[PDB]
Amino acid sequence: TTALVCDNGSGLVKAGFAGDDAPRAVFPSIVGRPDSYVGDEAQSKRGILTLKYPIEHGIITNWDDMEKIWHHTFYNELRVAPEEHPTLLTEAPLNPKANREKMTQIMFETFNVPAMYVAIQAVLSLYASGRTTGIVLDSGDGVTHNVPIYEGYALPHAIMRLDLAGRDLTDYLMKILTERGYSFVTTAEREIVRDIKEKLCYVALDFENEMATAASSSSLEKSYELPDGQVITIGNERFRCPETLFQPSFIGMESAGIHETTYNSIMKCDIDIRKDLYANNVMSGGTTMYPGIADRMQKEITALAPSTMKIKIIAPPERKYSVWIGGSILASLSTFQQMWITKQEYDEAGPSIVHRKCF
């Protein structure tokens, strides 16, 4: 028996088998309807199909499209029988309990898996680094979370959500490149702008100094080759787009930066655990992959935090898949095998068992 690990994101579904070091199937989490197409198939036929996201801001809202995503992952993407594998799933922090119950109900009634488990994505990201206590910056594609975790428990009284993630940064980069004369209004243009964001954009240690250097010299400019042979030059946008994470006002959002929200979450926590939260600051998600974001986060929090406090930011190079990696570490443990919500336990207890076993 091999345990399926499936991290469901707003932009990417990352699925694979426990024990693997990387998701066997990482694909966009979109559903196309004119029969339905899921993932890359729907992404290719953007003109013919209408695309919908079953997950928005990390919380599942469209359950039919989510069920289609899960079926595509099990059969069309992993090519394994769901009924033979204990399926480990993931949930967003502060997920409504009705969503967890619906998740287990669909897992056991529609897929008939022999076992399953639901874990918070930030908790898995913290597990993947060998930690049980610490604060996780889970910044993905639809939402950013600051989640303090005390011995595997995500404290609901300090978790905070910021609707500012990789997708908003892609839109902001499109806006800036339009300001510089580059036309990016189409879906393919959005995809190539996302590619530019992934390959060239970075977090500046000091935004004002970086802007001054970009204005004065031209060393920070980088060249990018568009699919249709066109070559563009990107200058200050290599650090203006990521800066929206720390200064959301760039996109008209009145909320605080990721550093300020991290400090707010740590302040909402008991004063006895704040030192451990500062010393274990885990960055996770695709939007935390910008070069220099770890140093910038450390500097900003050191500015906000008390001087005597020691702040360490943990940003593993594989942090883009750290949720799935933590899930694969989880589902392949010997002590975890009794934690699976078995089909028998679900039958004798009902969906609400997910509250009493997965917490």
Where does this chain bind another protein (CB under 8 A)? 95, 97, 100, 127-132, 150-153, 155-158, 268-271, 273, 329-330, 333-336, 338-339, 352, 354-359
320 makes contact with ligand ATP (CB under 6 A): yes
- CA dist., res. 65 & res. 51, Å (int): 10
Q: Which of 289, 311, 314, 325 binds ligand ATP (CB under 6 A)?
A: 289
Q: Which residue is nearest to ligand ATP (CB)?
A: 9
**Cβ of residue 159: shortest distance to another protein, in angstroms?**
9
**Cβ of residue 90: shortest distance to another protein, in angstroms?**
14
- CA dist., res. 174 & res. 188, Å (int): 12
Cβ 37 vs Cβ 90: under 8 Å: no
Cβ 144 vs Cβ 127: under 8 Å: no
Strand residue runs (E) in 71-132: 87-91, 115-120
Nearer to another protein (CB atom), residue 207 or residue 336: 336
Element (DSSP H or E) covering residue 124: helix 121-128
Nearer to ligand ATP (CB atom), residue 8 or residue 342: 8
354 binds, among ligand ATP, Ca ion, another protein, none (CB under 5 to 8 A by kind): another protein
193 binds, among Ca ion, another protein, ligand ATP, none (CB under 5 to 8 A by kind): none
Amino acid letter, 265 = S
- CA dist., res. 126 & res. 152, Å (int): 8
- CA dist., res. 124 & res. 7, Å (int): 10
Element (DSSP H or E) covering residue 314: strand 313-314
166 makes contact with ligand ATP (CB under 6 A): yes
**Cβ of residue 121: shortest distance to another protein, in angstroms?**
15
Q: Which of residues 135-154 bind Ca ion (CB under 5 A)?
A: 140
Q: Number of H helices and number of E strands within the chain?
A: 14, 19
Q: How many residues bind ligand ATP, per CB under 6 A?
A: 22
Question: For 303, what's the count of Cα atoms within 13 Å in the CB-facing half-sphere?
Answer: 9
- CA dist., res. 104 & res. 102, Å (int): 6
Nearer to Ca ion (CB atom), residue 9 or residue 351: 9
Q: 137: closest CA among 320, 283, 242?
A: 283
351 makes contact with Ca ion (CB under 5 A): no
Q: Which of 86, 142, 248, 351 binds ligand ATP (CB under 6 A)?
A: 142
Q: Which residues bind to ligand ATP, rule: CB under 6 A?
A: 9-12, 55, 58, 140-143, 165-167, 194, 197-198, 285-287, 289-290, 320
Q: Using CB under 5 A as the criterion, which residues of the chain lie in contact with Ca ion when the complex forms? A: 9, 121, 140, 323
